[PDB]
Design a protein around this ligand. Structure first.
Ligand SMILES: CSC[C@H]1O[C@@H](n2cnc3c2N=CNC[C@H]3O)[C@H](O)[C@@H]1O
Ligand SMILES: CSC[C@H]1O[C@@H](n2cnc3c2N=CNC[C@H]3O)[C@H](O)[C@@H]1O
Ligand SMILES: [Zn+2]
Ligand SMILES: [Zn+2]
Ligand SMILES: [Zn+2]
Ligand SMILES: [Zn+2]
Lengths: 434, 435
């Protein structure tokens, strides 16, 4: 007998690809997808609780594969700037000044609350005070990869990388048996981490079976600079140092030559596409369809709210689906089904969670999002997945579960106090603004 | 002489002068016009019949959707994954020939207008069939519109040929002679569907009536090259030679722009109507917006139709435009948030020839206004409300909409439409078309 039976108009399981189930039901038990079946059959099975969801599309929860969640408190603080001046003259100085453990707890919770409301059940974070990030994640009920920030210089909470790594080990330790949080390593970028630190990270990840997330090939200037100073592209450097592989998550990759493509194919590394951030900083255009056609796993992320500036993964996914057609020069590139897969299954693959989350298969965790497609602007619906990708906003998100626990009920966050978070964000904004 | 309505938002963005935002000011409306913008104390001391507090909201000129095919809302998501010519010839044109009746147009247009008002659009341009029926729906909705008479080389719904389309348009131009909200324009579809004769016809008609022309131009590489190979001139050169270009010409799309094109737009003071999401989705290309803007071309923005977008979200289109423009031009300072808002308001006004009536919050202009709510969680903290509007707000933040001081949207609710009935009607159309 199920704990919960959901009866939506449409289910999109993502696996197998391209299909939509009409008048079916999904049964949840013990925090897992126990059955997907026609309604008659599923109803005959019975459940503690039943929820009809007419006009709704039920999908795997969205996976935001790259972000810096507490930068939510810097939303819109630094517009109109290309990458290097954005970092050096605005963001880094503001991080040195403001970012404490209290900043991180408030900013992360604000970010989570925003993400759950837009259907995101799993997220990747690359930001300071990971220990604090995990406490907030733990309380929220959502799933996360938390990457340990490794940089060649002092950062908030870590005078240097050895301290960041040592704090990282303590964290790996504690969370060994957490159902929802995975620790990973977060070397920032090629130009802010040495060969030595990169090797220590590799060995640690061999030893711990952990992931690596890094900004790679964000800008032409990063690549040309690396070519002129070291005579090798930053990706070949990473390949030479042995970091590439199925647990390596290369974020951005707007600069991809044919050697780059060959390396990603060979090693089976994931690329995390951040289209809006790459547009906003004038970083370039990640060649998504090309990567996809070559078999590279391509997930999607929002990046931070100072270079987006929302945490809307559904919106990011639409932007990616539109952009990819014109970048590639074919209207058939990254169709709605594949765009949804990028937002779900490919994120789970990128984070090493494909066996737990990312599709609606029996036995997987019940990380689910229900989207409402009954609104005036979504009519008429010829294809619900098309309507999701190209004509629905994140405000259509009604319900969200993680591991079968409901975190959003008819648009209301069950584990957060929006009114308190807003008052808190506001307090932060006035102190940072003054 | 108190205002009819006094609006008290946290922020006002007047658009003119550019780049400014007023805090704790107020906008008084009288006789359908902006009577005054003033600090809140002064405004309140003046007096008003009705007063609306708008804490946490940003008041702006209403958004101007400068290109659409409004009744194609009933084809929303019907023809995905197709480039332009096969989208048109193998899908959309057949579906239009099969379904577009006066009834289709009434239902589809109202559906589109209701979607748009909810998204903060007070003025829109239509280029679609049965313009007469369109005007009836616009008239009832209270919204402002340019309605473009479709001119094509073949039979269209409601016009067996060009001659007949223009017949109806004259009558329309006449009937709507004194209309406060509705302007009639001509809508030659595209260079490859409109002959030179028909083009010369429109020029003289528009000279005589002092009316506008809107036309899809230089949408794709293939159109520019086929024209070059068949006729030895670029469509925009052909239009220049024919004498159509000028301050009342609205060139839609323009993803293909060389220096000669650029000179002709600059010389003639023609407008470009940028449709970023449609250009991306049909794999048409990238309009060089910042280049146009730096050359001093007026660039406005449109959603296009719901079968190549597929929403009618102008604010979302404006966000797309503002992001894309940076990366297309290769500088993070291109199309900043204030200018993107300008593109969605005042430039759309200039494009439609309505800049003296709308597009900015200056005294004496029409009170076409939109209130965006920036007090939501995902919009905190607000450092700069216009940045937040463009880069971090959805169209569901739109709370209130007025056109000519008449409220069309009140706290998210439409005062002139029945959403429940429109939905039911959209669904019937949906069932028939899919069956
Ligand atoms: C890798 S630790 C997180 C660090 O990365 C910085 N960051 C935030 N957003 C981006 C960042 N870095 C590089 N690329 C641009 C963008 O993805 C952030 O400010 C912080 O300093
Ligand atoms: C002048 S009538 C408007 C006509 O243009 C067609 N159209 C709709 N959306 C677009 C159209 N035409 C050309 N370019 C692609 C896009 O803007 C529409 O289906 C209708 O046939
Ligand atoms: Zn990042
Ligand atoms: Zn975004
Ligand atoms: Zn069009
Ligand atoms: Zn859109």
């Amino acid at each position: 007998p199920f704990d919960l039976l959901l009866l939506p108009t449409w289910i999109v399981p993502v696996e197998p690809a391209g299909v939509v189930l009409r008048d079916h039901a999904l049964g949840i038990r013990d925090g897992q997808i126990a059955l997907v079946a026609p309604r008659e059959q599923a109803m005959r099975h019975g459940a503690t609780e039943i929820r009809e969801l007419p006009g709704m599309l039920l999908a795997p929860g969205l996976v935001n594969a790259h972000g810096h969640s507490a930068m939510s408190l810097f939303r819109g603080l630094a517009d109109d700037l290309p990458l290097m001046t954005w970092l050096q003259d605005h963001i880094w100085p503001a991080e040195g000044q403001w970012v404490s453990e209290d900043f991180i707890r408030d900013g992360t919770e604000l970010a989570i609350a925003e993400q759950v409301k837009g259907g995101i059940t799993c997220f990747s974070d690359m930001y300071f005070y990971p220990q604090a990030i995990c406490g907030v994640v733990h309380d929220s009920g959502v799933r996360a990869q938390v990457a340990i920030p490794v940089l060649d210089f002092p950062i908030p909470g870590a005078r240097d990388s050895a301290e960041a790594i040592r704090q990282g080990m303590a964290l790996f330790d504690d969370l060994k048996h957490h159902p929802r949080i995975r620790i990973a390593f977060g070397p920032h970028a090629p130009y802010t981490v040495s060969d030595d630190k990169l090797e220590q990270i590799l060995v640690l990840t061999e030893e711990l079976d952990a992931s690596i997330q890094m900004h790679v090939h964000e800008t032409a200037f990063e690549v040309e600079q690396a070519m002129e100073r070291n005579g090798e592209r930053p990706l070949a450097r990473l390949h030479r140092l042995g970091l590439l592989g199925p647990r390596f998550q290369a974020v951005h990759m707007t600069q991809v030559d044919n050697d780059d493509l060959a390396m990603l194919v060979e090693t089976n590394s994931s690329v995390i596409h951040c289209p809006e951030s790459n547009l906003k900083l004038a970083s370039g255009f990640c060649p998504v369809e090309k990567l996809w056609q070559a078999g590279v796993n391509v997930a999607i992320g929002t990046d931070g709210a100072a270079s987006n500036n929302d945490l809307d993964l559904l919106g990011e996914t639409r932007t990616a689906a539109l952009l990819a057609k014109a970048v590639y020069g074919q209207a058939t590139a990254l169709d709605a089904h594949r765009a949804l897969r990028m937002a779900t299954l490919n994120g789970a693959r990128a984070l090493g969670l494909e066996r737990l989350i990312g599709s609606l298969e029996a036995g997987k965790a019940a990380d689910l999002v229900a989207f409402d497609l009954s609104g005036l602007a979504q009519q008429p619906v010829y294809d619900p997945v098309s309507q999701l990708i190209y004509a629905s906003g994140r405000d259509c998100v009604r319900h969200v579960w993680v591991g079968g626990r409901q975190l959003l009920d008819d648009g209301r966050l069950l584990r957060h106090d929006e009114q308190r978070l807003i008052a808190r964000a506001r307090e932060w904004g006035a102190k940072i603004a003054a």
